[model samples]
Every structure is written in C-alpha cells, then in structure tokens.
Target: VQMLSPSEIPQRDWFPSDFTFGAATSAYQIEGAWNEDGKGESNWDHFCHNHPERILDGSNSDIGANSYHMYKTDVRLLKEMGMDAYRFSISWPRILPKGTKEGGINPDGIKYYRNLINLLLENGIEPYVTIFHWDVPQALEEKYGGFLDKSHKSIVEDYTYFAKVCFDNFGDKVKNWLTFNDPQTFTSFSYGTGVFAPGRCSPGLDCAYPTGNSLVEPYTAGHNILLAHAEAVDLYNKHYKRDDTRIGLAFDVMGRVPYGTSFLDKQAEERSWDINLGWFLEPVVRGDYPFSMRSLARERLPFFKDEQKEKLAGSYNMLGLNYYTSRFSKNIDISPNYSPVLNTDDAYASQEVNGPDGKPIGPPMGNPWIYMYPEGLKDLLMIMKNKYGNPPIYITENGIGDVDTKETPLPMEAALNDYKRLDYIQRHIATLKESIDLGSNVQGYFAWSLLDNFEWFAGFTERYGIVYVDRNNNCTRYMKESAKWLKEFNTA
Candidate 1:
C-alpha cells in the first residue's frame, strides 16, 4: 500500500455529534470458550468440531480470539483505541443450551455478557449487541430442522423467544440491537452453497449434508429468518422499547454496476440490486419481496400473510449495512426453457469483477473477495437515501481481510505493519464522509473487527482486524500500524 498524506485522514468532526465511531466483531469468531461453562454446542461448534477439515486451516472455533476468557482485555483494547462503541453478538447456545427455554437457561452465559457490558460502560464504551450472527443453537437443528421449517410458528416462534431472553437479560444497557447479520448471505451460504454452519445443499453439491434443494432451502430459510426478525421487532416495540433503545438488521452488500453498454446489462444491474439489497430491504421498507424477485422466482420465494406483512413493515428504527466490495453485473438468459436449479440462479445475472474491456472494477486488496472500491460504499448509501427511506444506517463492517497461509506465513512484524488495512479503511471512511455530505442518513461507522477472529470457513487465514492478534502465544493482542492510526483518528 502506498503511503497516504496525513491530511487525507477523515475527521470525526465530519459527522454529526451523535454519530457513532467504533469497531465490530461477532461471537463465534471471537468468543471461543466453546464448551467451558455449561454452554451447549452451537451449530457452528457442531459444524467445525465434527468437520475441522471444513476450515481452510483445519481449525475450529474452540479457542478463536480468546475473547471469551479474556473479555476484559477486549474492553481494554477498545478503550485504548478510543472507540465509542463495540458491536458483538451473543452466542445462542452459550445463552440457551437448547434454542428455547424448555431446555433451560445458562446463568454463566448471562453473567459473562453482563460483566462484558459492565466493564465496557465503565471504560466509556457503548455496547451494541447482535441477537444472532449465524450461531444457531445446534439442539434446534435436530429438534425441528432449524430455519428449514417453513412454518412461521416453528422457527419464528423459537427465535422470537430467544430474542426475548436477550432483551430481558441485557436490554437495560445495550442501546443498539441487531436482530440478524446478513440474512441473505447466511441463508444462501448455509442452505444454498453449504459453505457455512448446518451445511446443507443439493445432492450434486459438495457438503457435509447434501440433502437440500439449493433452489428451495435458501429462500425457505431466508423467509423464516425474515419472519423471525419481524417477530423480534414487534416483541421489542410492544414490550422492551426502553427509552431510546433501537433494533435493526445488519445487511452485507456487494454494490453492483453494469458490465456492458447494452440496456440488458443495465437491467441486469438492477436485478442484482433487487436480489442483493432489496431482498431484505424491500421486505422491511415495504411489506414483501422485490417485484423483480417475485416476477421471476415466484414459485421459490415464500408469500407473507397480511398479518406477517404488518409486523414486517416499518419494523426497525435503525439499519446496519456491511460494505466490502462491488461487482459488475452482466445479463444472463432466463428463458422459460432455462430451468434454474439454484435459488441464486433466479437472478438471471452473472456477476463479474472485470468489465467488457477486461479491466477490474477496482484494485484487488489483501482479501481475495475485497477490492478497493470506496465509491461502491457511497453508491449503496445513496440507495439508502433515495430508495429505502434512509433510516439512521451504520457502516457495521468495512475492513479488508488480509490473508495468511502456512506456506506463506505472515511474519509478526509484517502483520503489525498493516498499512494496507489502514489505507482501505481511510478510503472507505472518506467515502462515507462524502455520502453524508450528499444527504445520506448515515449515522455511524464501525470497522469490520476489533481483533483478528476465526473467520468462518477461512479459519484464521484472513485477518480482518485493525489490531493484530498473536494466536499462538495465549491469544495476545498487539496494535498494528493501522490500529495506531485508528487511535489517532478516533481521538481527534
């Protein structure tokens, strides 16, 4: 990464006084005391434990960033960096051994988060909690097929009850709540591609469990997740709407642009937007799926009853968007004879990194999936303003995942000198400032992670933290060059 001028750094004064500045992380990735204190196996525990080979490094989430054991250090680190907020998820199994109350509650789990919250506030940092971040309790999977069950009363009811548990326990201090992080990615990955926990895919696809219809399972699970979110919102609004507390869904998006000059490519770009952002945004902003989605995948996408729609509409007061990269959308044939087997195929658009002239949309960064496309983040924010009726959105996760491999082990010194991570965040934050200037209701900015975590199937291969974590030496954390820069940026 080329060295940037100090004057290029985004200023805190650029945003509103109440606008939040923070770092974010998740449960399974960071809190790795898997079975330490009467906590049952989450589906992720089941997935990684049963098939360690599934992770690129054959590592499980048994230890992770060790934030479960050394949570105080986590708060200390956050305070050290002058972060205003810290966003992390609650482990479902850690709280409720079984998905619901019938199994019994774990006091240790409640006590753990209570302490983490207490310590964070004592150190002048606000806590933002996520109800579920892909860590579904495993007992629920065997009990009633997890989110696979299409019936609202099944998964929706169970999930709502779990949210009730979180609200009653930790709702007092935690002001901002995220119902679910990236439902579209969660459903499609776990149900469609089978790359995540509770892996299930079509018979032909390679997965630990291949008894799913890739076309059917994703939407089926996605519907239930959406329904579950609506129920959580109603539960909170009706009962737990304490003072100014807020709840919202954190969506992960990859902004799109047309790959060609043809109008077909232009239409293809819009279709990608519908399936990507509008898939979840439309339901809450309006009351149903996007028209493009319903027009094509009518048979696959589920219908919401007027009753469910009532709950779904205007469900949240806040919105959390995670931006990483963007892609070029090219038109694809969706003729009647072209039968789509996978749910993603319904979009009838092929996503590409390069345009027709063979140039990438942006420069590739440390993480293979991420490209340096700050303008994409700006475009998505404009969509929030013009399309979805901009509701105090937050940049929940925006950082590059720097890669490390056994063959090419990242030296500790090299890891600490993370200039690229700093540059990526600088550009994105600068872009975010531009969005706010252009009338986007963006109220917060949270970098992807506070520490290097157990990144899903990638294991610890891709480090997405401003802080460098020494996983071998007792999970000790050290500030990288980027974190040092962030500390300066945050303070001023």
Candidate 2:
C-alpha cells in the first residue's frame, strides 16, 4: 500500500452509518485526586509514589490534569470534537477499597462515576467503560500477589466482584464494556520487564522490586487475567448483559512483518503474531493459547480446566483493537542452551524497524516506537476477518504523540497545530475504510486520547491527545488542529 496525502483520506460518509468515533482515557492515566473522596490506593498509586525515579520525568499522577474534579471539561472537549463515544476506565480500588466486596464498597467512588456517565449520556456520548486498566488494588497484591496468585483463586473472584459492582451500578448507562485494557502489555510490562505498576522482576534484573521471575511470572499473571476476564464475562452474561449491551477485552497489537523472503522469517512472523496477538485473543477465540505458544512455552504456560475452557471460548461480543506500529520479525535461533528471560522473547523472533534491505518499514511518527504504518491496520483487520472469526471490531486506540523534550518543550500554540496526529488519524481512517470495504466487521474508531494526561512510564514527555492540555496553566484544554479536523470529518 503506497502512502497517500492527507487530503486524499476518506471521509466519515465512507463508513457505515452505525460506525462510531471517539477518544479514550483510563482512570489512572487521567483522573488524579489519587487519595481523594475515600479512594483506596491502587498499585499504580503506590508504584508512582514509591518509585517516582523509575518514571521518565520522575513524576507521578498525584494531580493528573485534576480530571477527577474537571471531568465536565473532558466531556465538553469530546462534545466539541463531535465524538460519538468516550472510552474510559473505572478505578477498581476506588470503588472496592480493598479489591473485594467483603472489604466494603465506597459510595463516593460510585457516585463520581455515575455523575460522569450520566453527564456523557446527557450530551449524547455513549460511554465505553473499561473495568480494569492496570490499576490493581495494592491490597490484593499484598494479600495474594494480585493476578500472579491465581492458584489461590483470589484475583479471579475479586476481579469478578469488582466487575459485578460496576455492572450493578453503571451498566444501565454503559452500552459497551471492555473487561481489561491490553492484558498483553499489562502482564508483560508489569510482570516481565517490571516497567509498570507494582514493578517486579527477577533478581539481577533492573527493576523496582526484584521479587518476580520474568520467565514464568508473565504467563502466570496473564493466565489469571484471562481467567478473571472469563469469570467477569460469565458474570455479565449470566446476570447483567442487556440485549443492546456488549462486553469484551481491549488488546494492543503492533503489526508484524516478515524480515525477508526467507521462509524462516515468515515462520518467525507467525510466531510473533502467536505470542503477541494470539496470547490473549486465541484463548477467547478457541479456549486456549495459540499452538505456537503452547509448544514453545510448554509447562511454563498454565492450563485451563475444561469448565474454564467453556467460559473462555467465544467469550466476547466484540474485540477492541488498539494499534500503533508494525515491526519486522526476524527469525532467531533457538538453541538447547538458550534460556528465556522475558516472555516476549519466547517466540524466538527479533522485532526490527527496517526490513532485510535496510529500508524503514514506514515513515517515522516522531514517537520512540510508533511508525506511520496505515497498511498494518488493514492487514490486521484482514487477518481477523480470515483467520480468527471476525467479531465486530472497534479501533479502540490509534494515534501518534508529539515529542516534548526538555530543550524542545512544546508550547500550547505549536502543540495546537498537530499536523502529525491529524495525518496519522486521517491515514488510519482511510485504511479502516478499505478494511470495511474488504468485508472486515469494524464498527468504530477511537483516537488514543482526548487530553494529554499522565502517560504511565513516559510521563508527560509524549503528548498523545488531539486536545492541547496546558499543564502549566490550570490544565486548560485547547483543541488541536487534529481535533478540529476530526469535527469536520465526523460531520461530513
């Protein structure tokens, strides 16, 4: 697929009339007031407070855009952008202070979200609520090691309890529910690399806490997340699922390309997809991990019970796909002496930015990892349509961020003229049009964010929002060119 100028991108009329457009945010990344209104401490709250040095800017979301108090402005921004929906998460710890119903629920937390959801509905914006977004309750981590201690069945029960609470309180208003946001990234980064909340890794590994085994723990944690998701979906299906509402998990996928014409690289590309996309997706689609993952990880990967398999298979009503970039997958030798360190390395493939001919896979998008690869989105859609049963899909997150270095801090005026984000969205939307034309079942598209709030480890150094958030001045939001362009695109 050749690149096209921004003016050539497709308009909203090209998509189905039922297709939705929106922006997304998570509670930990946006709503500060960390300890306010009786909210309990989350893993992220503890992680950032205890190890601010680990974050890129040595900062925390103690007051992140103060969105807890300023969510009305957030909804206003989305309304101004003409978004049809707003995808956000509810803090588990905030509602269930100790991560279980027995620990006592917080009425204030429920009231806050109720007000937010009510306001969104009042403004004609559908709420897409993500039940968990990596903000695990510190209480549960202390009790049974959080998701890593699934052997005790604590995380699954507690997570389901939390989900039930959300459903009972807010499901009446929310039409779409995503159980967990990017379980792949959450497990790998939090358990394998220890770069995320409750940072834990093996001894000798550089991390905040060297109590985790990177090789075994990521899979264990991921296994529990899938089980928890299954339990939550079962709960919703049995009790709360309305005829018009749906529940699913959101997955973050970076597209993979074979490094060369060699069959080895092509095989490596398949392994990469199995490990990355198939890890969580295959379980929901077929009741277990991918064949490659099962063969490679073997005993390291957990096995589901027959009853668990029944719940896992065909669990979702939809699939939320968050795409950003693509990588060239090169085959790597798997020798007898090889030892896996990170779970991502289990695939025996190296992720490269360029192909074997030294040509970049696509144009750079200014962020450290993202490249402008609209074709990747189309390829992933086709893969879903052909390989996995193509469920109704949502482009849950697709956007580029502006780089803000200390020497080149982006001023509000310059940040407002975000042609890079505009071009990225336009190109991806055009690709989505092509995928839809090719019989892909995509139903919606959401830009990554509505405001530049707290990015997890990168801090605020990367600005992803189409709305310019002035951190130095009361967190005032000003519409970027991308947001203005989206307004016209959505109306067209």
Candidate 3:
C-alpha cells in the first residue's frame, strides 16, 4: 500500500467502507408545497402565518427551497456527490393531516414520500429518515395542546400511529429511521426559550404566546416526547423490526468544557453533560433520567411509570448525536437566590463561549451561534462508547452557517466561496475518524444540510447548506466550494 502524506482532511478510504456519508434536509425547511394537495396545516403554518414578525425576515416556508417540486433535482445532486445515504425528515402533518387515524390518511402525502424513497433506492442511496422534525398538525395543537400532554394520552397514541403509518408504507424501502430529530431542542426552544414554532415563554418574555411557564412546560413537552418515542420504538420493535433495518433518535447535543481546572468547574461540566446528553440517553438506554437531573429538577422533571420504563429501555439499536459546538461550562449558584427560567438551567452552569482565561473554547466560525470545536465531538464519542455502553452512533447533523444580513444581500459568489464552513466540515469528519480509531461505535456522518432552506426563526439569514439554494431564481441549487470539495472527497 502506498503511504499517503500527512494531511488535515483524510480521504474516503480512511473510513470504514460501510460507514455512511450523506447530507440532511427537513420537510418544513425544504418541502415548499406546505398547503398543496391534501396536505393539512402544521403548527408551524399557524405560528409563521400569525406571527410573521417572529421570523427574522418575516418569511414563512410557504415555498421552502421548492423541494416538494424539486426532489428529483435533490436526488440527482446526491447521486452526483456519490453519497451513501440521504437523511431527510417526514412531515407529520403531511401524512396524518389532523394528527390522528380518524383524520384519514392523505394519499398525495404518502405518495410523495414513496416516490422520494423509490427514487433514492434506484440511485443506490439509503434513506435515513426522521419521522418528525418539530412540525405538529395544527389540529392536534388546538385539540390536545400539541406536545403538552404529559401522560400516555392521545398525544402518544397519535404519534405511535404515525410511526406505524411510516413503517407500513415505506419500511420495505427505508432501512434506517429516527423517531424524532431532537426532543431537547424542540421542547426547550419551543416551550422554554420560545424561539421556535408554537412559541411560548414566561408572561413578560418575548414570544407569540407569552403565557407559558418556561421551566415546567419544557419538561412536560419533553416527557411527552420521550413517552411518544418509547411507544413508537416499541411498535417498531414488535411489528416493523427487520434484520436489515435500524432505528434511533437524533440528539441536539451542544458539547461542554470546564471553564477552569477547579473541581467546581469540572462538576459543572459533568452537570452540563448530564442535563444535555445523559437526560435523553440514560432514559432510552437504562430506563430513567440521570440522577443529577432528578436531583436538580425534582418534580419539574416528569416521572416514568414502571411499564413506560420497560418500554423505554433498549428502545433503539442505534443513536444519532447532532453536535455543532462546545461551550465553557462554569459553575453557578444552585441556591435559592438563583432560580432557573429555562429547563436547561437546572444544571446550574453557565454555557459561556469564552473561558475564564479570556479565550474561546474553540476557533470562531462565520455563523454567530456555532464555534469550531471538533475535539469536543471526539470527546463526546469516547464518552458515548465508554459510559453509555457503546451503542452504534452517527454524527447525524454536523455543519456551520454563514451569516447573511437583510440589510446587505450576500453576493452569490461570496455565498458560494464558503471556505470556513468547508474547514468546519472537514475538521469534524477528521474528528469522527479519530473517534472511530479510539473504539467509538460511530457508523455515519451526515452533513447538516443539502440546501439553504428556511432556518426556523432565523429564516434565510443563515446559510448552513453546502448546496446553496437561490431563492431569487426559483430555488435553483448551486453547490458551494464545500460541496465541490465533498463531492471530490467522496468520489476520490
């Protein structure tokens, strides 16, 4: 074998042949025909239409990247890149219009996914599908308060039935599935921070609906998410499990670092980890929340019934860790004087970017929200392997965004010249290699996005896709420098 020269970005041959490389996109973000055919209204439709001002550009996803009509183009792009898989989300509201079996399934909605899956398979691209990516049927939001149901009520039943719908229709073609994209993000951001759909927060805070208790509501929504996911997994296990198929959930994990060498800082780091990954992982893996979470949140965190616990444990054969950046975790007051306004603050740690030494945890990126912290990915993978019993994991979503302000339209050339985002992707992929070398059961790495679509509250202000979707030109996709590099890397 010829010895290759030392390089920052490793070649495709460096990874296992079975490992997957793909790009990701969501239904609400990519599928433009939100109200087309028999498709019913999603909660996001209500949120965006009613509160247009909530989005940075006053834009809704009525025509999100036009993927509903351009899915053929998307599949062609993936085939050109030689991608092994495509990670995309199925819109819950699309299939079960009113979010229940009684609502009657939509034929056009089911046909759209079937067409997409068949196309993907024909091109030799595996479909790594997410059942829900935070789009709830508006009817459910109005009827049962969406994800607010704490117990195994209609919320859990409806969600499980939706999963069954997916399995019955597309399970023969699709081999990989994720129950939910990120329950932590959907719960906290929607209920606690109130920056997402069905936005809710404290009475005085900013949101579409400000009559929410950030602390309790997030946990309530979170508990419901867990229970719903458990029920879905159980259904899949009994009825849908096949030797060729695998199922899991994707976690929105923000890595953490101790602010200093002090014992308190280290404890704070662990606390942050417990609140973030361990909160969901422990329950799915071992049947309960972390001990730290129970002690910190107490009654605020919901309890699981004995039967629910049994259903939750060993719910998946795989896991998806969606890591983006790391923060300096500093110990803060856990006393009565410092009360948490959000569910995540129960950790009693501040997620700071700059350390006590006046340096960022990692290098800065073009996007304001993310910092380049590839080592954090490696660390978390080791933790997953060692502490969490080595369940097969995938780097489900990994990429950075380029900020685009409304006042100044980013030139197409400037948008396409995305070197920093390219570096970020390469470094993260390199980190994945290191994790695999160190015995992490990492099987795949899917980039954050395939096209620049609706970025939730940010609207189109941030471009996170390697393939730039030009809104002015009817959502024509142009592969940026990163995409070009990735294509070459994958095809080499």
Candidate 4:
C-alpha cells in the first residue's frame, strides 16, 4: 500500500475489498412531511414548533429536503454516486404512533421504509439502518419524561418495542443496524445543555424547559439510553437473530488532546475522553460507567443492576464511531465553589479549541465547534484498537460543513465546488486506510450526510452534505464536487 503524503490523493485500492463506503441521512433531518400520512408527532417536531427561539435560524424540519416524498430521488442520487451502502434512520413515531405496540403501528410508515429499502436493493446498494435517531414520540414524553422517564423502565420497553418492529419489518433486508445514533450527543445536548429536542436543562438556563437538572439528568438519560440499548439487543437476539445481522450504538467523539506537555494536561485529556467516549462505551464494554465518570459523578451517576450489566456487556457485534474534530483539554481544579453550568463541566477538564501556544488546534470549519484534524482520527482509531479490544468498527459519520452566512452567502454554483469538504474527507479516508493497515478492525465509512438538510439547533446555517439542495428551486439536488470525487474514488 502507498502511504499518503499530506497533499496526496487516496486510491480506492488502499482499502480492502469489503470496506464499504456510503452517505448518511437521519429521518428527522431529511425526511420532512413531518405530520403527513398518519405520522405521529415526535419530540423534535414538538420542540421545534413550540420553541422556535431555541433554533439558530428559527427553523424546523417541517419540510426537510422533502425527502419523505423525494426518497426515490435520494436513492437515485445514492446510485449515481456509486456508494456501496446508504445509512438512514427510521422515525419511531412514524412507525409506532404512540411509542408502544399497544398503541398501534402505522402501516404507512413501514411501507415507506420497505419501499426505500427495496429501491436501494434494486440499485445494488446495501442499507444501514439506525432504529432510533433521538426522535422519541411526543406521546411518550407527555405520558412519561421520554428518555428521562422516572422509572427508566418505560423507555426500555418503548424503545425495545420500536426496535423489534424495525427488525421484524426491515431486518431481512438491512443486515447492518445501529440501535441508537450518538447517545452521547443526544443525552448531553438534549438533557444537559438543552440544545437538542425535548430541551431540558438546569433551571435558569437558555433552553425550552428548565425543569431538568443538568448535572443529574444527563447521567440519568445516558443510563436509561444504555439500558434501552441493552434491552434492544436482548430483543434482537432472542427473536430476530440472524447470522448476517449486526447491531450497535453510534457514538459522537471529539478527539481530546492535552493542552500542554504537562502531566496534569495529559490527565485532563484522559478525563475528557472518559467523559466523551467512555461514558457510553465503557457501560456496554464492562457493563458499568467509566472509572473517571463514576469517581467524578459519584452519586450523581446512576448504577446498573446485575441483570442490566449482563445484557449490556458486549452487547454488539460491531461499533459505530462518529468522529469530527479534536479539542485541547486543559486541566481545571475541582473545588467546592465550582458548580457546573452544563453536565460536561463535571469532568473538571475544559475542552478548548485553542492550544497552550495560543493557536487553534486546526483550521475552523463551517460550524464553530468543528476544526480540521486528520491526525486526531488516526489517534482515535489506534486508541480504539489498542484500548477497546479492536472490535469490528465503522466510521458512521465524518464530514465537514459549508458556511451559510447571510452576510456573505455563496451562490449555488459556487457552493457546488466544495473543495474544502473534498479535502477533509480525503485526508480522513487516508488516515482511516493507515489505521486499517495498522490492524484496526474498521469495515466501513459513511460520510456525515447526503444532502443539505435541517441541522438541529444550528438549523440550515451549516451544510454538511456532498449534495447541495437548492431551496429556491424546489429542493433540487445537485452533486457537489465532493460527490463527484467520491464517485471517482469509489469506482477507481
């Protein structure tokens, strides 16, 4: 294999023959028709409608790319791009209107997915389906507290029922399944910062609902999500087990770097990673919370039952990692006077983009949070291989976004160039290839998105798609330069 230089382009042959390439889209982010065709309301629908102020552009996914009706076009686009697979999500509320088997199932919802899956199969593309993408039915939230339900049993039952439904319906076709997408981001943002759907945070915070305790709710929600995942795995194994099928959770990781060459800073980086990757992963791996998280959170973090631990340990056949950028972790003191405004602060390690040298770790992307750091990806893969037993893995989501500033918006023609995204994806792919050569068990890579759709909280201001959708031209899809490059790379 040829080692790639910083400026070198990657050859498709560098990756193994079985290494899959795909583009990803979530239901709520792309499949609009929010309330159409007997679809029940989701927490995201309620959150965006009732609390428009929470979103950056005061926008919702009410007509997100109109993909509910335009899925055929989406499949065509996927085929045109020559992707081996397509990773998309199924809406829980769309399938189970009331979030339970007793509440009745929506046949139209099942039919929609079946048709989509069939189309993808007809076009010689595999389907990687995420059973839940954080769109809990509003009925469950109103009846209980959704993922933060007091008993926690309610979410497990409801989520397991939803998973079973998907498995019964689509499992035959979709060999690859992700039970939950980015539980870390979902719990932290949804329950901790109140930036995501069903916005809940500490009282006096800038969210739709101030009833949630940022410190406690994040952990509680995370605990329940892990439990729910374990329950889903149990159900899938007991009833819908197939030799070809695999299920796992997707985690969003911002690689952590020590701010300085100090032991304290290195410790801070480890602490940050514990709170970031280990929060969810450690539970499923060792059947409990990470050592650092348990120590720092103390009584604030919930404990897993013996039975829960049994189900959670090694619950997956593979793992999904959504990597973006790296952060400089600076050491901070834990003091009695210190109180966390957000749950992330419980780590007592501040994640800063700027290093100790007073410079950003890498070039900034469209989103303020994302920075270019290809080396971070390599480091994370090595960490996964060395520390996490080298489980079968997939890079489920990785791509940068296009800036959509109103002050200086680029025209559609100019936006279609997307050289930055191309470069970002290429460098990451090269890093991934290097990781594979070094014996990381990575099997696939899915780009963050397929089309410009509703970005939660940020709204449409950040575009993370290889395909540009013209909002003024009836959501017309145009393949960006990155898409063309990927097509060439895939077919090379």
Measured with C-alpha atoms, the lDDT of residue 340 in candidate 4 is: 70
lDDT (tens digit, per residue) of candidate 1 on 452-492: 98999999898888888898899999988888878887787
Badly placed stretches (over 4 Å) of model 2 are 1-7, 150-152
Instruction: Give the clash count for model 2.
Output: 0
Model 2 is weakest, by summed lDDT over 10 consecutive residues, at 1-10
Candidate 4: stretches off by over 4 Å: 1-7
- What is the TM-score of each predicted model, taking all chains together? 0.98, 0.98, 0.98, 0.97
lDDT of 2 by residue, 1-492 (tens): 244565687788888788999999999988998998889999989999999988988888888878899999999988877899999999999999898889998999999999999999999999999999999999998899899995738899999999999999998899899999999999999989999988888778889988888888999999999999999999999999989999999999989999999999999999998999999999999999999999998998999999998999999999999999999999997898777889898999999998877878988888788998889999899999999998999999999889886868987777898888888888999899889999999999999988888889888888999888888888888889999989888766
In model 3, the runs with Cα more than 4 Å from the true position are 1-6
lDDT against the true structure, per candidate, is 0.89, 0.90, 0.90, 0.90
Query: Lowest lDDT 10-mer window, candidate 3?
Result: 1-10
- Position 313, candidate 1: lDDT: 94
What's model 3's overall lDDT?
0.90
- Top-down lDDT ranking: 2, 3, 4, 1
Decide which is better by lDDT, 1 or 4: 4
